[PDB]
Symmetry: C2
Subunit: 322 residues, 2 copies
Amino acid sequence: MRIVALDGYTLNPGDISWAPIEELGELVVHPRTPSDKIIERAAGAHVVLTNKVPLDMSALQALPGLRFVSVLATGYDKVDVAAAGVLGIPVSNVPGYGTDSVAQHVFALLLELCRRTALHDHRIRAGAWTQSPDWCFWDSTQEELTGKTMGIVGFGNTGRRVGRIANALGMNVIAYAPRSRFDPDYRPFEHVGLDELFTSADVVSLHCPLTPETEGLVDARRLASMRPGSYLINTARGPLLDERAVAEALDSGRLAGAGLDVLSQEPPAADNPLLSAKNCLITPHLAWASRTARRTLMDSTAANIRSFIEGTPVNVVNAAHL
Amino acid sequence: SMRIVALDGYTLNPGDISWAPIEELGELVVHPRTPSDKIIERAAGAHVVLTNKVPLDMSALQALPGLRFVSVLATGYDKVDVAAAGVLGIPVSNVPGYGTDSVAQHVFALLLELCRRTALHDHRIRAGAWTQSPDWCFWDSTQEELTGKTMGIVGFGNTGRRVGRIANALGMNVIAYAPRSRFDPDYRPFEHVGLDELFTSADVVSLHCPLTPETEGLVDARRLASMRPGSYLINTARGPLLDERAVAEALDSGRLAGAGLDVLSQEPPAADNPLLSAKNCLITPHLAWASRTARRTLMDSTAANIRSFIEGTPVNVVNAAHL
């Protein structure tokens, strides 16, 4: 059995192992694949692995040998899985691999906005501690989370993890939980409508899929409803925000800070308003990417392939179309 | 009617909180800081003096015969000769517990910046690294998860315990060197350990103990050699808890993957402090205590101390034995 990874570099840039996949067939790993080389490289493969390499109906029909696709992610927005279905190709993803990676990144962003440790380290190195008229200093107000309300938009695995951490930091937690009425074992906790979340939360973290209903959720109106000095964190999907309104909220002081691992355009423009905004922290879509999570992602991908071989495919995202 | 002087109020309130709780209790004057030659001038006539780090010795206290009460804007009072104050009949109060959450959260701000380097990647984006990247994402520093790592907590008072609860919630195992208390928290995995066992078993060590003869140079070459390679050290407690040389060498050798330090043995540091030349060392200027919430609490507790002194029953007295 012949297996091809079209963009394996981000999953394994030399610090983990393909061994679990290599046990199941003949593997070829390309670090990335430009669009004009997709059919060439995928030709002859029984199984294709893709993270973000697109597979549309025209590519799928040009690969008659293709029997199974596994996506190296929870999201599969760049794979036309419906077209795969009608051609009789199951498509699997991996949910749950990065719950801890992502939830901890929400707090890495948030605490760096609150304390700005790296800034103060830089200032020490420029001699700011000697230059200071006091025994200590800070160029950025030090902010504590204790007693603030964490509002969690979307309450799947990652959202729930964010909530458990928030609780342990002494925050109140409120969740907009449309897909599930899940009650955690900690207080204070409460389910709220989306409107109520924005009026009551001091920190808002986004953990929902991008859909018609959630496009531009964080808009000028919901921002205006928030308490001044609030924080926004987004490790989910860029188009959940109106980027303009958020930049203006940062500059006005409505938002004391924003921590963003995703943007509507990746990579961003130099003149994207979020790159010129004060108190904005941005990371390059790496929240998912701890060595532990990628290791887990590798194993779960091997499990998906093993299951397809055994005749009972798991994590199928196009069951309705087969 | 009562006269109150703050000799170094800037660090407590640099314009973002309010002296109102103190202003209700007397006539307040707030100096942002006070050099040593100006202490007597400024404190003269005051019933109550507030000091964070302005020193008060026997000679200053005797030159202020009007002085009836000192409140220290900190838990520590090492620069105040509180024994001399006692014999002159001056109660000295401090404020314990104001910064428990501020400090515990700073441990994790340092640790998560070492593990994810969010600010580094923000800087690289701003230098155009995301456009220059051949992939949809990138990282110049391996992203490291705390899940399944062991947090070793040296000293298990309030701050230490807070650090432990947070660690647990991040999926870490917790072990504590807890000499002053056999306190059992309501989470697992948790275990009490000896100090040597803590260093051999912990992936992250955080210091939360007072500086004494017994704990000076606790983090020495020997305990560092016992640690697993790739471990992290965090110190928001006291600079002399470390042998700074051994730690620099551990960082350069790769024994320590990183160190997060809010204090140093000399503050401010020299250019030739070995910790300023060491790789993977994150340093912040003694600000772990300093969240706006903690300073707000510190203000209120200071008003409570003064209110209690006026009512004749002074609270948080640190020199009762000399009174």
